Amino acid sequence: SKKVLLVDDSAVLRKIVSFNLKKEGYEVIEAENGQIALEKLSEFTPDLIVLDIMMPVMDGFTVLKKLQEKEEWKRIPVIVLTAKGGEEDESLALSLGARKVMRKPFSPSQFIEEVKHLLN
Template sequence: MSTHKILVIDDSKVIRMRVKDMLPEGNFDIIEAKDGLEGFNLIRTENPNLIMLDFLLPKMSGWEVYQQIQKEQKFRSIPLVLMSGRKEEVTDKITEPFEYFSFVEKPFDREQLVDAIRDAMLKAKRQPQGTAEISQPPSSFTTADTSALTSEIELLKLKIAKLEKESEQMKKQFNQLVGFIKQKLR
């Protein structure tokens, strides 16, 4: 029996199936919802470990689902990946940088999806744990601040590692191209 549940809320069956196919093999169940209302009901009943949420949905929009998630601490702590074909639809409602969830623009590939999931998992840990909102910024660093900064540093380290890998690949390709040109010039 699977121990992790991933909820994919999207009105497009093609996207739901594509997400399902792109996810790495693992010990989890994929739960699908075709509209926002069904998706929010599944959030409440299934207690997913990750939510993949389309922003434009029938019956209850992704924006409305997001607002409902933000109202309850137990839902805010679930890693969330928002998906949309147009980023400006999201940024019209929620300003960047996206602090507590990850965003992936459609169409996306497997690597972008996995990166978004990792990012969402790190950001979910930064959610304030209390139910009351903090009206004033703290005057000194707290444990939560340190934890948030540590999470951000880990995220930056992942990005740096990815960039270094891409840089090495580009160097290899460049050297191959130079070798090919030299060979043709002989």
């Protein structure tokens, strides 16, 4: 029933995060890059977005930025899940509207705890 837009350029990463999300009964739509993600928002409005930073075509900082430029989007919570480990990368993502930033490698169980907290 709850719908998550999962945005990452690694198929390997998407598979494992989609597996843990569907374990909870969530529905998953995949985007391979940030532009594809923004195009998917015309088909639907997800209850949550899981967002990578480093992606070809359109990165995650740019996604976050544009998400704040439409009003239907600007309110969908976003959890950023990224190999980017700097405090300044985190601050920037938060300043751009992300609700939470988690750094890869990640614990799948901690990640699902945080996904739940944003969906409740």
